[PDB]
Amino acid sequence: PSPEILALRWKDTCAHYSPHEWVAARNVVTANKAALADYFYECMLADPNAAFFLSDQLVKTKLHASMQDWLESVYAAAPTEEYERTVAFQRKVGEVHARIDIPVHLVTRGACALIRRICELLDRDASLSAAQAAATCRYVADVTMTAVEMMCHAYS
Amino acid sequence: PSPEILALRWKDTCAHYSPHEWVAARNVVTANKAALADYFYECMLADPNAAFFLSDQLVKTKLHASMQDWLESVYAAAPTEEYERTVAFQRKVGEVHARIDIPVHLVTRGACALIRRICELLDRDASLSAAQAAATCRYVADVTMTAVEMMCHAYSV
Amino acid sequence: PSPEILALRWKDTCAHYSPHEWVAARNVVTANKAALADYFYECMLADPNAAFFLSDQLVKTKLHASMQDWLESVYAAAPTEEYERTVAFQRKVGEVHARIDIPVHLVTRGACALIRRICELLDRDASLSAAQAAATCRYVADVTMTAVEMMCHAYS
Amino acid sequence: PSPEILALRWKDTCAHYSPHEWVAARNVVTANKAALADYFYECMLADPNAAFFLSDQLVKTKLHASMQDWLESVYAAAPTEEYERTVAFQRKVGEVHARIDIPVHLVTRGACALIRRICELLDRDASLSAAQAAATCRYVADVTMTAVEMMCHAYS
Amino acid sequence: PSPEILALRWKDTCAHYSPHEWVAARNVVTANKAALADYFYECMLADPNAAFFLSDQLVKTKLHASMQDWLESVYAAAPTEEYERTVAFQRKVGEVHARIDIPVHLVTRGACALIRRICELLDRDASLSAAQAAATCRYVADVTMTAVEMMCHAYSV
Amino acid sequence: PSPEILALRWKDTCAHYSPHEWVAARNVVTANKAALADYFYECMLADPNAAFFLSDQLVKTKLHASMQDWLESVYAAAPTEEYERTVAFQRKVGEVHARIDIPVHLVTRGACALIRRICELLDRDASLSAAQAAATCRYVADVTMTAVEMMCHAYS
Ligand code: HEM
Ligand code: HEM
Ligand code: HEM
Ligand code: HEM
Ligand code: HEM
Ligand code: HEM
Ligand SMILES: [Ca+2]
Ligand SMILES: [Ca+2]
Ligand SMILES: [Ca+2]
Ligand SMILES: [Ca+2]
Ligand SMILES: [Ca+2]
Ligand SMILES: [Ca+2]
Numbered sequence: 007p008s009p010e011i012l013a014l015r016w017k018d019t020c021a022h023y024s025p026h027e028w029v030a031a032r033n034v035v036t037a038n039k040a041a042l043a044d045y046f047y048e049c050m051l052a053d054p055n056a057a058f059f060l061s062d063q064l065v066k067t068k069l070h071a072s073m074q075d076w077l078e079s080v081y082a083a084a085p086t087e088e089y090e091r092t093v094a095f096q097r098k099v100g101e102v103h104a105r106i107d108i109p110v111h112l113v114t115r116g117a118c119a120l121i122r123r124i125c126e127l128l129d130r131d132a133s134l135s136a137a138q139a140a141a142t143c144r145y146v147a148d149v150t151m152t153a154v155e156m157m158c159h160a161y162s
Numbered sequence: 163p164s165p166e167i168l169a170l171r172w173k174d175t176c177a178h179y180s181p182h183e184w185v186a187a188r189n190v191v192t193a194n195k196a197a198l199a200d201y202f203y204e205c206m207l208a209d210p211n212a213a214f215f216l217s218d219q220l221v222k223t224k225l226h227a228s229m230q231d232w233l234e235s236v237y238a239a240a241p242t243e244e245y246e247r248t249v250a251f252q253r254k255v256g257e258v259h260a261r262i263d264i265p266v267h268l269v270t271r272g273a274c275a276l277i278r279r280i281c282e283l284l285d286r287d288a289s290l291s292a293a294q295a296a297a298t299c300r301y302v303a304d305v306t307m308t309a310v311e312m313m314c315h316a317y318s319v
Numbered sequence: 320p321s322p323e324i325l326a327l328r329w330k331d332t333c334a335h336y337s338p339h340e341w342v343a344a345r346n347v348v349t350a351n352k353a354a355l356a357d358y359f360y361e362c363m364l365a366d367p368n369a370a371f372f373l374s375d376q377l378v379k380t381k382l383h384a385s386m387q388d389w390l391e392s393v394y395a396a397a398p399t400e401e402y403e404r405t406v407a408f409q410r411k412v413g414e415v416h417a418r419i420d421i422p423v424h425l426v427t428r429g430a431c432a433l434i435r436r437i438c439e440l441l442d443r444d445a446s447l448s449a450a451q452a453a454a455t456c457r458y459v460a461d462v463t464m465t466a467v468e469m470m471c472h473a474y475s
Numbered sequence: 476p477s478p479e480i481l482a483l484r485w486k487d488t489c490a491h492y493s494p495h496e497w498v499a500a501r502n503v504v505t506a507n508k509a510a511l512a513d514y515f516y517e518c519m520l521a522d523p524n525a526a527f528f529l530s531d532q533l534v535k536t537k538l539h540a541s542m543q544d545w546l547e548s549v550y551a552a553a554p555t556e557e558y559e560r561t562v563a564f565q566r567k568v569g570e571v572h573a574r575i576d577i578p579v580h581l582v583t584r585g586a587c588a589l590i591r592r593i594c595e596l597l598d599r600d601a602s603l604s605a606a607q608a609a610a611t612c613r614y615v616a617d618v619t620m621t622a623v624e625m626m627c628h629a630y631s
Numbered sequence: 632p633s634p635e636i637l638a639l640r641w642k643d644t645c646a647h648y649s650p651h652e653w654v655a656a657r658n659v660v661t662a663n664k665a666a667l668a669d670y671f672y673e674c675m676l677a678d679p680n681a682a683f684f685l686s687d688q689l690v691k692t693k694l695h696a697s698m699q700d701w702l703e704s705v706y707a708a709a710p711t712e713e714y715e716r717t718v719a720f721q722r723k724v725g726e727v728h729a730r731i732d733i734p735v736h737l738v739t740r741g742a743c744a745l746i747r748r749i750c751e752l753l754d755r756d757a758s759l760s761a762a763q764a765a766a767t768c769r770y771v772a773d774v775t776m777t778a779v780e781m782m783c784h785a786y787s788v
Numbered sequence: 789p790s791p792e793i794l795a796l797r798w799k800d801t802c803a804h805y806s807p808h809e810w811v812a813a814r815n816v817v818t819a820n821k822a823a824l825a826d827y828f829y830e831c832m833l834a835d836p837n838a839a840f841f842l843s844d845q846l847v848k849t850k851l852h853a854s855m856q857d858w859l860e861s862v863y864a865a866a867p868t869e870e871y872e873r874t875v876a877f878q879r880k881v882g883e884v885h886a887r888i889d890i891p892v893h894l895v896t897r898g899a900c901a902l903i904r905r906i907c908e909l910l911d912r913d914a915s916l917s918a919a920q921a922a923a924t925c926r927y928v929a930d931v932t933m934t935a936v937e938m939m940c941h942a943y944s
Contacts, residue, residue, distance in 0.1 A: 110266050110314050111317070114270065114307060114310060115308075115311050117307070118303065118308070122304055125299070129293075129300075136292035136296075137285075144282065147274065147277055147278065147281070147303050148274065151277075152274070155271050156267075158266050158270055162265040162266065162267065213374075214374065215374055216374050216376075217374040220374060223419065422628075423579050423631065427620060427624045435613060438616070439613065442609050449605040450598075453608065453612070454598075456609070457595065457612070460587065460590055460616050461587065464590070471580035471583055472578075472580050475578040526686075527687045528686060528687075529686055529688075530683065530685050680789065735944065736937045736940035736944065739933060740937050743937070747926055747930060750926050750929070765907075765922060765925065766911075768907070768922070768925060769925075772907070776897070776899070776900035777897075780897050783896055784893050786892050786893070787893065
């Protein structure tokens with residue numbers, strides 16, 4: 007629909023959680039964003055179906071930086087209240103993947119890898135309580151899947 | 163893309179976790195599946211782009227019961243070592259939604275709703291330790307997204 | 320209850336009228352079949368009770384067309400002398416509604432909507448005489464109800 | 476499903492036509508009510524399937540008269556603005572047939588017989604204009620079907 | 632005509648026989664009542680002056696079962712010493728037929744059909760002696776006709 | 789109906805039995821007809837409801853003879869094949885009772901008294917076998933009730 011309609015959805019999704027979850031998510035992600043980019047592309051490059059669209063060269067010189075930026079954007083949206091900008095960036099990214107025919111199932115898997123690795127990182131935070139750590143993991147899955155849904159509008 | 167091939171992916175994804183996460187996840191899912199189906203279709207019926215594809219009759223007499231069996235299938239797979247049947251079922255399910263042109267992002271949102279609600283139930287289990295609940299929640303996200311990935315193979319062509 | 324038996328009833332019902340009524344009805348129905356299905360499904364979709372059994376997807380991609388073919392089949396039966404096939408189609412259609420428990424009074428109401436609209440269209444026909452348009456309306460209601468009766472065997 | 480609710484539907488249905496159609500229909504129906512019940516029960520009694528639910532005693536001493544009053548009630552409703560009472564009577568009538576399992580397709584067929592005969596009688600009316608007789612037939616079918624729909628609520 | 636008064640007539644008519652005729656009659660009737668009802672309505676449905684009053688629906692859903700209970704009532708009366716209830720029931724039944732103007736001679740014919748068929752069954756009982764069968768047959772005619780007499784009080788006015 | 793139609797009914801009713809039953813019935817009745825008349829009117833005269841229409845005088849001078857004649861007629865019909873005459877006599881007798889308003893229930897009781905007494909007489913015949921005695925009692929009830937039914941046509 008409208009990027010104004012989508013911005014509301016994002017904000018509604020994040021509004022289920024307190025700013026404390028937004029911040030814990032955004033901190034663990036900004037501290038580990040390069041290692042999250044590493045983990046993502048080493049998963050992709052190892053799948054011959056996905057390494058069809060990837061190369062070790064294209065990762066180290068472009069996608070690795072693009073992925074870090076994408077992580078920062080996803081997790082700064084609610085803290086900054088920059089909902090309309092992030093949803094526009096998501097539709098731009100989604101449009102790049104549909105144009106070159108990236109299988110949507112591989113986009114789904116990549117989101118799943120990010121969710122898993124962030125949540126494992128949150129688990130070892132120790133500076134978070136158990137309930138705070140659990141609420142934040144649920145927010146991580148929520149907001150990453152929201153971002154991917156925006157991206158996947160380009161496939162319909 | 164053989165189901166024996168895809169079955170290796172389901173099994174590797176589950177093998178990242180101990181059977182104790184498989185079982186904990188399966189018990190909360192199997193005990194709340196009707197509640198989980200309710201949550202799934204009241205989300206969809208709330209969004210008019212997804213309401214387009216649904217009727218109250220269709221949900222009540224078919225999809226509500228089909229959602230519970232889908233949940234049963236996903237969470238029985240690793241404990242029953244029945245990866246190959248489960249992947250053939252997910253592939254067949256995804257082929258039903260692509261044939262009627264259900265937008266893939268709506269399937270994603272549905273997945274997201276299920277993962278959220280199951281992890282909320284896991285969070286109030288009390289019989290799970292903090293560490294066990296968090297590992298079971300990561301399994302729930304992994305295995306549900308793997309299942310949805312198998313469904314969305316039907317959207318590649 | 321054999322299809323050969325019910326076809327007798329269909330044939331007798333239509334033999335009350337001449338071929339000119341069959342042809343005038345079939346003509347107005349074929350020139351207006353999409354609009355008749357439009358009117359049919361806008362009535363059904365606006366009543367919450369009936370809208371309970373319909374998704375807008377089902378209407379647009381399946382029923383809007385199936386209704387057109389149903390109308391075509393009903394008004395071709397007597398002119399093509401295809402009585403036995405038509406009644407067998409009507410019975411199977413009736414069975415689809417009983418199987419999912421479409422309330423029969425909604426099926427009645429829908430038949431009534433088709434009759435009213437077809438007869439309104441027949442009244443605007445300037446190429447037909449007064450007495451011809453009246454006999455044709457009488458036939459329209461007769462053949463439409465006849466088809467609904469066969470659909471309604473499935474509910475006993 | 477309240478009688479107040481269904482009366483809305485009856486009122487809306489009749490408001491599609493003017494009082495002149497209500498009165499012309501009511502007039503032809505009242506001058507011909509015994510003959511209409513004659514035609515109704517001779518059709519039903521000659522079909523063995525329907526004759527299964529009827530004794531000739533029941534027809535002569537009860538139903539031949541009850542059918543006359545049913546016709547009177549249906550065509551008085553809009554002219555007497557008695558919508559709520561009429562729909563409550565229709566519902567109770569419908570319940571008598573469901574209780575003894577009168578097949579609904581026979582009820583449909585009987586409605587169709589009444590519509591055809593009333594509209595034939597309307598076509599022979601020399602005191603009515605062409606366009607008036609056509610609008611009146613359209614109303615006859617509408618109000619007759621409306622009554623049968625209310626009878627048919629009992630079958631769901 | 633009080634039912635206590637009429638009850639004396641039923642009881643005197645039965646007292647002409649021993650309880651062994653009451654019991655023998657009741658057992659053959661109670662064991663064949665569905666068969667007896669069948670015989671009753673295929674007679675009536677065969678005569679067009681009586682078919683006038685009947686529909687296949689009415690027989691199948693109502694009168695077939697009402698005929699068996701009537702048979703039960705008539706043959707339970709003397710053994711249960713419930714004369715007064717039985718006469719009030721017969722009076723109420725006859726009032727239903729006179730109200731719809733069932734010709735009284737048709738009721739008589741129905742009685743005649745029942746008495747014939749029950750006495751034919753009594754005749755092939757084998758566990759009754761010749762003398763016992765004949766006494767039980769005379770009771771069957773007596774008690775069935777007494778019952779029909781109570782019914783036809785409704786035709787006096 | 790027609791006395792020709794009724795004569796057939798009588799003959800059909802008697803045709804269920806062999807001439808041997810007709811003859812055994814007709815013999816025991818002709819040998820005891822005065823004692824059967826006695827038993828009948830001593831039952832009637834003892835009921836004040838029935839002795840309302842009777843007197844000891846009217847019995848000994850008329851009805852007693854009329855009753856014997858009636859018994860002979862009923863039991864000679866099938867042996868003589870005089871079906872049409874007996875049914876005409878039955879309607880004449882029935883017409884006398886309806887004209888003076890004899891309660892039909894007392895006519896029923898009187899037939900029952902005759903049936904009982906004849907069957908008791910047959911039981912002690914000894915010149916009849918058991919099966920022959922049983923078939924004849926069933927014929928006695930059959931033909932007496934047939935006669936009374938004819939008589940009771942006058943009440944409808
Ligand atoms: C959650 C999943 C994913 C995220 C967040 C993501 C992120 C991004 C971003 C931010 C860009 C840059 C867009 C731009 O500069 O306009 C991009 C481009 C690209 N992505 Fe993705 N991506 C995902 C999944 C995938 C997958 C599964 C593949 C499989 C090969 C893939 C292959 C590529 C390629 C080849 C480009 C370069 C496009 C070009 O240079 O023309 N991505 N991605
Ligand atoms: C992860 C998300 C979903 C899951 C697990 C799921 C599960 C299922 C299952 C198990 C069936 C029955 C398959 C069969 O008939 O063999 C089904 C059918 C169906 N689903 Fe879903 N579904 C999902 C998303 C959706 C969404 C988002 C929509 C609509 C907005 C939708 C609409 C339908 C419809 C209309 C059918 C039936 C098609 C028919 O009966 O012809 N589904 N789904
Ligand atoms: C005049 C009355 C009606 C006519 C002539 C009619 C016509 C038809 C026909 C021809 C089909 C066959 C579709 C197929 O087999 O491919 C169908 C199916 C169906 N109709 Fe109707 N219809 C009537 C009334 C209604 C009403 C009142 C409802 C609901 C309010 C309804 C809902 C449906 C549904 C749910 C299906 C099943 C579609 C599916 O799942 O395949 N119909 N109708
Ligand atoms: C247009 C359709 C029909 C109409 C308007 C209609 C009218 C009526 C009405 C008003 C009554 C009420 C009698 C009362 O309550 O006193 C009634 C009862 C009844 N009707 Fe219909 N009828 C229709 C169809 C049929 C059909 C098709 C049958 C059988 C083939 C049937 C058989 C009966 C029966 C058995 C009763 C019950 C009478 C009783 O035992 O009291 N009707 N009808
Ligand atoms: C000895 C002969 C008969 C017996 C024992 C008998 C018995 C009964 C009984 C027990 C009932 C139900 C009473 C009630 O509803 O409370 C009944 C009703 C009825 N009987 Fe008979 N019956 C006899 C003769 C007949 C005959 C000869 C006819 C028609 C030719 C007839 C027609 C009916 C009808 C139409 C009803 C129902 C009236 C209604 O439902 O409104 N009966 N009978
Ligand atoms: C099976 C039962 C009955 C039979 C066979 C029978 C026989 C007859 C016969 C043959 C006649 C002469 C008719 C004639 O000459 O035209 C007659 C007349 C008469 N019967 Fe009956 N009857 C029966 C029941 C009753 C009952 C219950 C009463 C109750 C009082 C009664 C009172 C009379 C009377 C008073 C007459 C004389 C009519 C007159 O003289 O004007 N009968 N009956
Ligand atoms: Ca922790
Ligand atoms: Ca916990
Ligand atoms: Ca015109
Ligand atoms: Ca005219
Ligand atoms: Ca024996
Ligand atoms: Ca003997």
